[PDB]
Design a protein around this ligand. Structure first.
Ligand SMILES: *[C@@H]1O[C@H](CO)[C@@H](O[C@@H]2O[C@H](CO)[C@@H](O[C@@H]3O[C@H](CO[C@H]4O[C@H](CO)[C@@H](O)[C@H](O)[C@@H]4O)[C@@H](O)[C@H](O[C@H]4O[C@H](CO)[C@@H](O)[C@H](O)[C@@H]4O)[C@@H]3O)[C@H](O)[C@H]2NC(C)=O)[C@H](O)[C@H]1NC(C)=O
Ligand SMILES: *[C@@H]1O[C@H](CO)[C@@H](O[C@@H]2O[C@H](CO)[C@@H](O[C@@H]3O[C@H](CO[C@H]4O[C@H](CO)[C@@H](O)[C@H](O)[C@@H]4O)[C@@H](O)[C@H](O[C@H]4O[C@H](CO)[C@@H](O)[C@H](O)[C@@H]4O)[C@@H]3O)[C@H](O)[C@H]2NC(C)=O)[C@H](O)[C@H]1NC(C)=O
Ligand SMILES: *[C@@H]1O[C@H](CO)[C@@H](O[C@@H]2O[C@H](CO)[C@@H](O[C@@H]3O[C@H](CO)[C@@H](O)[C@H](O[C@H]4O[C@H](CO)[C@@H](O)[C@H](O)[C@@H]4O)[C@@H]3O)[C@H](O)[C@H]2NC(C)=O)[C@H](O)[C@H]1NC(C)=O
Ligand SMILES: *[C@@H]1O[C@H](CO)[C@@H](O[C@@H]2O[C@H](CO)[C@@H](O[C@@H]3O[C@H](CO)[C@@H](O)[C@H](O[C@H]4O[C@H](CO)[C@@H](O)[C@H](O)[C@@H]4O)[C@@H]3O)[C@H](O)[C@H]2NC(C)=O)[C@H](O)[C@H]1NC(C)=O
Ligand SMILES: *[C@@H]1O[C@H](CO)[C@@H](O[C@@H]2O[C@H](CO)[C@@H](O[C@@H]3O[C@H](CO)[C@@H](O)[C@H](O[C@H]4O[C@H](CO)[C@@H](O)[C@H](O)[C@@H]4O)[C@@H]3O)[C@H](O)[C@H]2NC(C)=O)[C@H](O)[C@H]1NC(C)=O
Ligand SMILES: *[C@@H]1O[C@H](CO)[C@@H](O[C@@H]2O[C@H](CO)[C@@H](O[C@@H]3O[C@H](CO)[C@@H](O)[C@H](O)[C@@H]3O)[C@H](O)[C@H]2NC(C)=O)[C@H](O)[C@H]1NC(C)=O
Ligand SMILES: *[C@@H]1O[C@H](CO)[C@@H](O[C@@H]2O[C@H](CO)[C@@H](O[C@@H]3O[C@H](CO)[C@@H](O)[C@H](O)[C@@H]3O)[C@H](O)[C@H]2NC(C)=O)[C@H](O)[C@H]1NC(C)=O
Ligand SMILES: *[C@@H]1O[C@H](CO)[C@@H](O[C@@H]2O[C@H](CO)[C@@H](O[C@@H]3O[C@H](CO)[C@@H](O)[C@H](O)[C@@H]3O)[C@H](O)[C@H]2NC(C)=O)[C@H](O)[C@H]1NC(C)=O
Ligand SMILES: *[C@@H]1O[C@H](CO)[C@@H](O[C@@H]2O[C@H](CO)[C@@H](O[C@@H]3O[C@H](CO)[C@@H](O)[C@H](O)[C@@H]3O)[C@H](O)[C@H]2NC(C)=O)[C@H](O)[C@H]1NC(C)=O
Ligand SMILES: *[C@@H]1O[C@H](CO)[C@@H](O[C@@H]2O[C@H](CO)[C@@H](O[C@@H]3O[C@H](CO)[C@@H](O)[C@H](O)[C@@H]3O)[C@H](O)[C@H]2NC(C)=O)[C@H](O)[C@H]1NC(C)=O
Ligand SMILES: *[C@@H]1O[C@H](CO)[C@@H](O[C@@H]2O[C@H](CO)[C@@H](O)[C@H](O)[C@H]2NC(C)=O)[C@H](O)[C@H]1NC(C)=O
Ligand SMILES: *[C@@H]1O[C@H](CO)[C@@H](O[C@@H]2O[C@H](CO)[C@@H](O)[C@H](O)[C@H]2NC(C)=O)[C@H](O)[C@H]1NC(C)=O
Ligand SMILES: *[C@@H]1O[C@H](CO)[C@@H](O[C@@H]2O[C@H](CO)[C@@H](O)[C@H](O)[C@H]2NC(C)=O)[C@H](O)[C@H]1NC(C)=O
Ligand SMILES: *[C@@H]1O[C@H](CO)[C@@H](O[C@@H]2O[C@H](CO)[C@@H](O)[C@H](O)[C@H]2NC(C)=O)[C@H](O)[C@H]1NC(C)=O
Ligand code: NAG
Ligand code: NAG
Ligand code: NAG
Ligand code: NAG
Lengths: 129, 453, 102, 132, 132, 53, 53
C-alpha cells in the first residue's frame, strides 16, 4: 500500500521561514513525481510545484517564484530501498498564507497522466500571525 | 457459379504490431581494436555491408514515439553492458583510510578556494608486514571533513565500495546497429515533415537500422543526427507542462572544450598484482578547464528556434530563457565524457535572453569530478583514472531539451529552461523513426475454383 | 491560461434521485477530472481521463461530455454522497459545487 | 523485347498494391522467413521461436487439404453473410491490409470448417479405396 | 436436432474406448504436440527435444508412401502369423493400449518392409514416366 | 497448533566496513519467558484414537 | 572467561539478506510439450497398484 505522512501544525510570525517534511513509504521512491499543493479558504485549490527525486529536478509556479525551495533525501542501503523524504521550504511569509498544505502522488495506471493525483497526505494547517 | 469457394493463400504480405527482442551488430572495423578493448564486441556479429532498404508505394502507417518500445530495452542493454565491463577490474577496498591533507603549492588568494588538495596516507605493500607512506592529489568534490589538525576521507566510503575502471577499456562510442530476427521487419518514416505522432504517407521497410552512437549527456545532446531543412520541436502534450520538449535543429554548431593542466600519472601497488593510479606532479600553471562556442551562430540558431516556436503559442508572445532552477549537480549544468574524463560545465551564460514580438566567442567554465555515479544505483560508485597531457575535444551541438514553466495567473511571457531528467530522451531523439512489426502469412479469400475428387 | 467555469453548483435535493453538475472550459481538446471533498476530510479521486473510475469507486458516478462541455452525473443519491465537488483540467482549477440535502 | 517492365520488389514490396497483382509473387514473401555471454541465450531463444512459429504454420496447413501446394482450393462454399462484397471489386480494388480488418470478426470458425471438411473427405475416400 | 450427443474430449480422451470410435478423432491428438538464469537452458533443451522428436516422426512418415495424408494405405499384405486375430473383433473389442502389447514383438521389420515397398514403387513409376 | 515466542526484541545495525551491514540483537524490553507451543487436548486424543483404530 | 562461535573452526558463514522472505508459496509443476501427467482420483488407494479411475 501507498502511504504519505506530513508534519504537525504550526503558527509562525510574519516574515519567517517554514520547512515541511513529507515522508513516503510503501513503493519504490526513485520512480515517481511528488507534487506540492495548497488550499486557502475562499480560494479553491492552487498548484505550487513538482519534483522528481531521481536527480531532484524541480519546477515551481510562476507567481510564487523566488520564495520556495524543494529538496529530497533518498534511501541508501540494500535493505529498505523504498522509503523517501521530500522537503519543502517556504520563505517570505505573509498573513495571506493562512492555509492547509498537501503533498500528493499520482495514480499508477496506464492511461494515468501526471496531474490526476491519487494518494494524499493528511494535510498541515499553517497559520501566520 | 455463385457458389464461391474459400481459398487459402500462404505468404500473403501483411503484418501486425508487436513487441519482441532485438539484435545487436556493428561493423568489422571495431574488431581491429582487438581483445574486447571497446565493449559491444563481446556480443556483436559483424554487420554485413549494404543491407537492403526497400522502398514502398501507397501503404501508410501511423507512428508514435511516446509509447514506442525497444527504447526501454536499449536503456536496459547499455546499463547491462556497463556492468559487464567492470567485474574483471580491480576493487578499491583498502583505499578508504584516514587522509592527511593540505593545500597544493600555489600563490593562493585567500578568498578563492583550492580546487586541488594534496594528501598523504598509509598503504599496504606487496607483502603483508611492510606498509608505506604515499601521497596523491584529489579534487575537492571527492573528499569531506572527518571530525588542532585537519584530516579528510573519501566521499563514498560510508555507503558503498568503489570499483576502478581498467585503463585498457576505452570510453568513446561506436556505431551500434540494431537488427530484427527472422520473421519481423522494421519500418521507417521517410517523410520530410513529421512531428512525431500520427500517419506518415511514405514509408520504407528495413532489416537493420542506421548507425547509432550512444553518448551520455544531460542537456545539449551531442554528435546527433540533424534534420533536413527547418528546426523541429516535438512534444507529447504541449499544453501539459510535465513533459519535456525535444528540439532538433538543422545546422550543427561547433563546440570546443579543453582542460589545459598537464598531468603525470603514477602507479602505486596495493599488493599482489594490483595496480592503482594516483595523480602525481603538475607541470605548468593551474588554469581552469572551459568550453568555447561561437557567438553569432549561437544567436542565429536561437533566432531560428524562436521563429519556429512562435507557431505553437500565438504570434504576439514574449519568449525568454533562464538557467536551471536547481537540484543535484549533474542536472543543473550539462555533463559529458571527453577523452576518457568526465566534465560538468556550467551553462548559465547561454540561456539569458528575451525576444520581442517583432568573431567573439562565449566561454563557460567547467569542473572535474573523478568519481562518478551514473544511473543513481544504490550501491554502485565508479572511480575514474586520470590521463596524461593537455586534453581538448571538438564536437557538434545538435539538439536541445527544454521545459516550460507552469505559469498561471495571466502572464503573456512563456519562459523556458533546460532540464536533463531521464537518460531515455537521448535515445528517443534517435529512435523517433522506427516501429517493429510482425509478419503474418496464410490469408484466406473467396474465389471461383473448386477442388476435384 | 485555461479557466474552468462551474455550473449550477449550489444544488439542494433529496435522497434517492439523480443529479448532474456542469463544467465548461475555455480551451477544448483536453481531458477532464472530477474530485470529491467531504467535510473535514481528505479529498478523493473520482474521475480521471473524463470517463475512467479510480479504486473504491461505485459506478453510479458517471462522467461524460465532449469538447469543452462536461457533465458529472450521479444516480441513486445516498447520504454519504452529499459533499463538495471539483472539476479539474491541468494545474488550473475550478471553484466548485455544493450538494445539500433537501 | 522488354524495354522497361516491373521486375520484382523486396519482400512486402507489393503489399501496398491490389491483391490480384500481389498474388503473382508469393515465393519472395515466403523465402524471407527462415534464416535470412548471456546474449547467446537470447539469440537461441529467438531462433527457436522462429522455427516454432514456422512449424506451427506448416502443421496447420498440413491438416487441411493442401500440404505443400502454396495455393489451394477446397470444398467449402463462401457464405456471403461474412463479407457482403462483390467479386468484381475485391481483386481490383483492395489490399490485404485493407482486407484483414474487414474479415477480422469471422475467423477461428473457418479453420474448424476446413478441419471437418478434410476429415470427412478423407474418411469417405478411405471407404472408397476400402471397397477398392 | 441433437439433444445430447458426444461432443468431443480432450487429447487422449478417447483412449480408453475401442479403436473404431477412437479413429474418428485424430486431429485433437495431433495438435497438442508442438507448443500447447540457468533455467533457460533447461527450457531451451526441452523445446528443441520436442521439435527434434516431431521432425523425426515427420521424416519417418515422409519416406513411406504418405507424407501428409494423416491416414494411409499401402501395398504390403498383412501376414496373419503376427497377430492371429479376427477382423471382426479388433475394431469392436480392443483398445490401442491393449493392442500395443500384442504387436510389440513384430516391430522394426514392418518399417523396413514399407521402406523397400515405397522404394521399388518409386523406381517402377520412375521407369513408367521415363518411357512416358 | 499455536506456537509463539513472547520476548520483545530490538535489532541493531553494526557496520562492518564499506557498505556492509550486520544485525545484532540489542536490548530486551520485558520479562524473559520461554517460547512454546499449544495444542488442544481432546482433539489430539480423538485423532490418536482414530489412528489406533 | 571467553567464548567463540561454534562454526568458526570448520567453515565460513553467510548472513541471509533481510529483504528475502521465507514463507512458502504455491509452486505449480507442469510438463513440457509432448508428455502428460496422470492422476489417480480414487478415494481409497494406499499407494501401490492399479487405480481404476
Ligand atoms: C563526437 O565525434 C567527434 C568526431 O569523432 C569526437 O572527436 C574525437 O574524439 C576522439 C576520442 O575518441 C579523438 O580521438 C583521439 O585522438 C587523439 C589524437 O589522435 C591524433 O594523433 C594520432 C597520433 O599522432 C594520429 O595517429 C591521429 O591520426 C590523430 O591525428 C589520439 O591520441 C587518441 O588516442 C589515444 O587513446 C588510445 C586509447 O588507448 C591510445 O591507444 C592512443 O595511443 C592515444 O593515447 C584518440 O584517438 C579525436 O581526436 C576527436 N576528434 C576528431 C576530429 O575525430 C568527439 O569526441 C565526439 N563527441 C564527444 C562528446 O565525445
Ligand atoms: C554559472 O555561471 C554564472 C555566470 O558566471 C555564475 O553567475 C555568477 O555567480 C556569482 C556567484 O558568486 C554571482 O554573484 C557575484 O558574487 C560576488 C562574490 O562576492 C565576493 O565579493 C564580496 C564583496 O563584493 C564579498 O563580500 C564576498 O565574500 C565574496 O568574496 C559578488 O561580490 C558580486 O556582487 C557584484 O554585484 C553587486 C551588485 O551589482 C555589487 O554590489 C558588487 O560590488 C559586485 O559588483 C555578485 O553578487 C554573479 O552575479 C553571477 N553572475 C552574474 C552575471 O550575475 C554562476 O554562479 C555559475 N553557476 C554556479 C553554480 O556557480
Ligand atoms: C494530451 O494528453 C492526453 C492525455 O492526457 C493525450 O492522450 C490522448 O488522449 C485521448 C483522450 O482524449 C486518447 O483517446 C482515447 O484512446 C483510446 C485508445 O483505445 C480509446 O479507447 C478512447 O476511446 C474513448 O471513447 C470510448 C467510447 O466508449 C470510451 O469508452 C473510452 O474510455 C474513451 O473515452 C479514446 O479514443 C488518446 O489515445 C490519447 N493519446 C493520443 C496519442 O492521442 C493526448 O495525446 C495529448 N494531446 C492532445 C492534443 O490531446
Ligand atoms: C575550436 O577549435 C578548433 C581548433 O582546430 C577551431 O577549428 C579551426 O579554426 C580555425 C580558425 O577558426 C580554422 O582556420 C580556418 O582555415 C580556413 C582554411 O585554411 C581559412 O579559410 C580561415 O582563414 C584563413 O584565411 C584568412 C584570410 O581569409 C587568414 O587571415 C587566416 O590566417 C587563414 O589563413 C580559418 O583561419 C580551421 O580550419 C579550424 N579547424 C577545424 C578542424 O575546424 C574552431 O574554430 C574552434 N571553434 C570555435 C567556435 O572557434
Ligand atoms: C491458537 O490461538 C488462536 C488465537 O487466535 C485461537 O483461535 C481463537 O480461539 C478463540 C477461542 O478458542 C476463538 O473464539 C471463539 O469465537 C467463536 C466465534 O466468535 C465463539 O463461538 C467462541 O465462544 C464465544 O461464545 C461463547 C459462548 O458460547 C462465549 O463464552 C465466548 O466468550 C465467545 O463469545 C470462541 O470464543 C476464535 O475464533 C479463534 N480464532 C481463530 C482465528 O481461530 C486458538 O483457539 C488457539 N488454539 C488452541 C488449540 O487453543
Ligand atoms: C604535496 O605536493 C608536494 C609537491 O607538489 C610534495 O612535496 C614534495 O615532497 C617531497 C618529499 O620527498 C620533497 O622532496 C624533498 O625535497 C628537498 C628539497 O631540497 C630535498 O632536499 C629532499 O631530499 C627531498 O627531495 C619536495 O621538496 C616536496 N615539494 C616541495 C615543493 O617542497 C608533497 O609530497 C605533497 N604532500 C604533502 C605536503 O603532504
Ligand atoms: C601513517 O603511518 C605512520 C607510521 O605508522 C603514522 O605515524 C604515526 O602517527 C601517530 C599519530 O600521528 C604517532 O603517534 C604519536 O606519537 C608521538 C610520539 O611518538 C606522540 O607525541 C603523539 O601524541 C602520538 O601518540 C606515531 O608515533 C607515528 N608513528 C611513526 C612511526 O611515525 C601515521 O599517523 C599514519 N597516517 C598518516 C595519515 O600519516
Ligand atoms: C503533430 O502531428 C499530429 C498529426 O498530424 C497532430 O495531431 C492532430 O492535430 C490536429 C489539430 O491540428 C487534430 O485535429 C483536431 O481533430 C478534432 C477531431 O474531432 C477536431 O475536433 C479539432 O477541431 C481538430 O481539427 C487531429 O485530430 C490530430 N490527430 C491526427 C491523427 O491528425 C498534432 O497536432 C501535430 N502537432 C503537435 C505539436 O503535436
Ligand atoms: C541560476 O541563476 C541564478 C541567478 O544568476 C544563480 O543564483 C546565484 O547563485 C549563487 C550561488 O548559488 C549566489 O552566490 C552567492 O554568493 C555569496 C558570496 O558569499 C554566498 O554567500 C551565497 O551563499 C551564494 O553562494 C548568487 O547570489 C545568486 N544570484 C542571485 C542574483 O541571487 C544560480 O546559481 C544559477 N544557477 C546555476 C546552476 O548556476
Ligand atoms: C496396498 O495396495 C496393494 C494393491 O491392492 C496391495 O498389494 C496386494 O496385496 C495383496 C494381499 O492383500 C496381494 O495378494 C496376494 O497375492 C499373491 C499372489 O500369488 C497370493 O499368493 C496371496 O495369497 C495374496 O492373495 C496382491 O498380490 C498385492 N498386489 C496387487 C498388485 O494387488 C497391498 O497389500 C495394499 N496394502 C498395503 C498395506 O500395502
Ligand atoms: C588552504 O586553503 C584554504 C582556503 O582558502 C585556507 O582557508 C583559509 O583559512 C584562513 C584562516 O583559517 C581564513 O582566514 C580564510 O578565510 C580561509 N579561506 C577560505 C576560502 O575560507 C587555508 O588556510 C589554506 N591552508 C594553507 C596551509 O594554505
Ligand atoms: C606535459 O608534460 C610532459 C612531461 O614533462 C612533457 O613531455 C616532455 O616534453 C619535453 C619536450 O620534448 C621532453 O624533453 C621531455 O622528455 C618530455 N617528458 C616526458 C615524460 O615525456 C610535455 O611536453 C608536456 N606538454 C606540453 C608542454 O604541452
Ligand atoms: C560535425 O559537423 C561537420 C561540419 O560542420 C561535419 O563535417 C562534414 O562531414 C561530412 C561527412 O563526413 C563530410 O562529407 C563533409 O565534407 C564535412 N564538412 C562539411 C563542411 O560538411 C561532421 O561530419 C559533423 N560530425 C562530426 C562527428 O564531426
Ligand atoms: C515491543 O517493544 C517496542 C519497543 O519499545 C514497543 O513499541 C513501543 O510502543 C509504545 C506504545 O505505543 C510506544 O510509545 C513506543 O514509541 C514504541 N517504541 C517503538 C520503538 O516503536 C512495543 O509496544 C513492544 N511490544 C509490546 C509491548 O507488545
Ligand atoms: C555519508 O556521508 C555523507 C557526508 O555528508 C552524509 O551526507 C551521508 O548521510 C552519509 N551516509 C551514511 C549512511 O552515513
Ligand atoms: C542576434 O542577432 C541580431 C542580428 O544581428 C541582433 O539584432 C540581436 O540583438 C542578437 N541577439 C542578442 C541576444 O543580442
Ligand atoms: C543575462 O544576459 C546577459 C548576457 O548573458 C548579461 O547581461 C548577464 O550576464 C546575464 N545574466 C547572468 C546572470 O549571467
Ligand atoms: C570444531 O570445534 C568443535 C567444538 O567442540 C569440535 O567438536 C570439532 O571437532 C572442531 N572441528 C575441527 C575441525 O577442529
Amino acid at each position: 500500500q501507498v502511504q504519505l505522512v506530513q508534519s504537525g501544525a504550526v503558527i509562525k510570525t510574519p516574515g519567517s521561514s517554514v520547512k515541511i517534511s513529507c515522508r513516503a513509504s510503501g513503493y519504490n521512491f526513485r520512480d515517481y513525481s511528488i507534487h506540492w499543493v495548497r488550499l486557502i479558504p475562499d480560494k479553491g485549490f492552487e498548484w505550487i510545484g513538482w519534483i522528481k527525486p531521481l536527480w531532484g529536478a524541480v519546477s515551481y509556479a510562476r507567481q510564487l517564484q523566488g520564495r520556495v525551495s524543494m529538496t529530497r533525501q533518498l534511501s541508501q542501503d540494500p535493505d529498505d530501498p523504498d522509503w523517501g523524504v521530500a522537503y519543502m521550504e517556504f520563505s517570505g511569509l505573509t498573513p495571506a498564507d493562512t492555509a492547509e498544505y498537501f503533498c500528493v502522488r499520482r495514480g499508477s495506471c496506464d492511461y494515468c497522466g501526471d496531474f490526476p493525483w491519487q494518494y494524499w497526505c493528511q494535510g498541515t494547517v499553517v497559520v501566520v500571525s | 457459379a455463385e457458389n464461391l469457394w474459400v481459398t487459402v493463400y500462404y505468404g500473403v504480405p501483411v503484418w501486425k504490431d508487436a513487441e519482441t527482442t532485438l539484435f545487436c551488430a556493428s561493423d568489422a572495423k571495431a574488431y581491429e581494436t582487438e581483445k574486447h578493448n571497446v565493449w559491444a564486441t563481446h556480443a556483436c556479429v559483424p554487420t554485413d555491408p549494404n543491407p537492403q532498404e526497400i522502398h514502398l508505394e501507397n501503404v501508410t502507417e501511423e507512428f508514435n514515439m511516446w509509447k514506442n518500445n525497444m527504447v526501454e530495452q536499449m536503456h536496459t542493454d547499455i546499463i547491462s553492458l556497463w556492468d559487464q565491463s567492470l567485474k574483471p577490474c580491480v576493487k578499491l577496498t583498502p583505499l578508504c583510510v584516514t587522509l592527511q591533507c593540505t593545500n597544493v603549492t600555489n600563490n593562493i588568494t585567500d578568498d578563492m578556494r583550492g580546487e586541488l588538495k594534496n594528501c598523504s596516507f598509509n598503504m599496504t605493500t606487496e607483502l603483508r608486514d611492510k606498509k608505506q607512506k604515499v601521497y596523491s592529489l584529489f579534487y575537492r568534490l571527492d573528499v569531506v571533513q572527518i571530525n588542532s589538525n585537519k584530516e579528510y576521507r573519501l566521499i563514498n566510503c560510508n555507503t558503498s565500495a568503489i570499483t576502478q575502471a581498467c585503463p585498457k577499456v576505452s570510453f568513446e562510442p561506436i556505431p551500434i546497429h540494431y537488427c530484427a530476427p527472422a520473421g519481423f521487419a522494421i519500418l521507417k518514416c521517410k517523410d520530410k515533415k513529421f512531428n512525431g505522432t500520427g500517419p506518415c504517407p511514405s514509408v520504407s521497410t528495413v532489416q537493420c537500422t542506421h548507425g547509432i552512437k550512444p553518448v551520455v549527456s544531460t542537456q545539449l545532446l551531442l554528435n546527433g543526427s540533424l534534420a533536413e531543412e527547418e528546426v523541429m520541436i516535438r512534444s507529447e502534450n504541449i499544453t501539459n507542462n510535465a513533459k519535456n520538449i525535444l528540439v532538433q535543429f538543422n545546422t550543427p554548431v561547433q563546440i570546443n572544450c579543453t582542460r589545459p593542466n598537464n598531468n603525470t600519472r603514477k602507479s602505486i601497488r596495493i599488493g599482489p598484482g594490483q595496480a592503482f593510479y594516483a595523480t602525481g606532479d603538475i607541470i605548468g600553471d593551474i588554469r581552469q578547464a572551459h568550453c568555447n562556442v561561437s557567438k553569432a551562430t549561437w544567436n542565429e540558431t536561437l533566432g531560428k528556434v524562436v521563429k519556429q516556436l512562435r507557431k505553437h503559442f500565438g504570434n504576439n508572445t514574449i519568449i525568454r530563457f533562464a538557467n536551471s532552477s536547481g537540484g543535484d549537480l549533474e542536472v543543473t549544468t550539462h555533463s559529458f565524457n571527453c577523452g576518457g574524463e568526465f566534465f560538468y560545465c556550467n551553462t548559465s551564460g547561454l540561456f539569458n535572453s528575451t525576444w520581442i514580438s517583432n568573431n567573439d566567442s562565449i566561454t563557460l567554465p567547467c569542473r572535474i569530478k573523478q568519481i562518478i555515479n551514473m544511473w543513481q544505483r544504490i550501491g554502485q560508485a565508479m572511480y575514474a583514472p586520470p590521463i596524461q597531457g593537455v586534453i581538448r575535444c571538438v564536437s557538434n551541438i545538435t539538439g536541445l531539451i527544454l521545459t516550460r514553466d507552469g505559469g498561471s495567473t495571466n502572464s503573456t511571457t512563456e519562459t523556458f529552461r533546460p532540464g536533463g531528467g531521464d537518460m531515455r530522451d537521448n535515445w528517443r531523439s534517435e529512435l523517433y523513426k522506427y516501429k517493429v512489426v510482425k509478419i503474418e502469412p496464410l490469408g484466406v479469400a473467396p474465389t471461383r475454383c473448386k477442388r476435384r475428387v | 491560461e485555461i479557466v474552468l467555469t462551474q455550473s449550477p453548483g449550489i444544488l439542494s435535493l433529496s435522497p434517492g434521485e439523480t443529479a448532474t453538475l456542469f463544467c465548461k472550459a475555455s480551451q477544448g481538446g483536453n481531458a477532464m477530472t472530477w474530485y470529491q471533498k467531504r467535510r473535514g476530510q481528505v479529498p478523493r479521486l473520482l474521475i480521471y481521463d473524463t470517463s475512467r473510475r479510480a479504486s473504491g469507486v461505485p459506478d453510479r458516478f458517471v462522467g461524460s461530455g465532449s469538447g469543452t462541455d462536461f457533465f458529472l452525473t450521479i444516480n441513486k443519491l445516498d447520504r454519504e454522497d452529499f459533499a463538495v465537488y471539483y472539476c479539474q483540467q491541468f494545474e488550473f482549477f475550478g471553484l466548485g459545487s455544493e450538494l445539500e440535502v433537501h | 523485347a522488354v524495354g522497361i517492365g516491373a521486375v520484382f520488389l523486396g519482400f512486402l514490396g507489393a503489399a501496398g498494391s491490389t491483391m490480384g497483382a500481389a498474388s503473382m509473387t508469393l515465393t519472395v514473401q515466403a523465402r524471407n522467413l527462415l534464416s535470412g555471454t548471456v546474449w547467446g541465450i537470447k539469440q537461441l531463444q529467438a531462433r527457436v521461436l522462429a522455427v516454432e512459429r514456422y512449424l506451427r504454420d506448416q502443421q496447420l496447413l498440413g491438416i487441411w487439404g493442401c500440404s505443400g501446394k502454396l495455393i489451394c482450393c477446397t470444398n467449402v462454399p463462401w457464405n456471403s453473410s461474412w463479407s457482403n462484397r462483390n467479386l468484381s471489386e475485391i481483386w481490383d480494388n483492395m489490399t490485404w491490409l485493407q482486407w484483414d480488418k474487414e474479415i477480422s470478426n469471422y475467423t477461428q470458425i473457418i479453420y474448424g470448417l476446413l478441419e471437418e471438411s478434410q476429415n470427412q473427405q478423407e474418411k469417405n475416400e478411405q471407404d472408397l479405396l476400402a471397397l477398392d
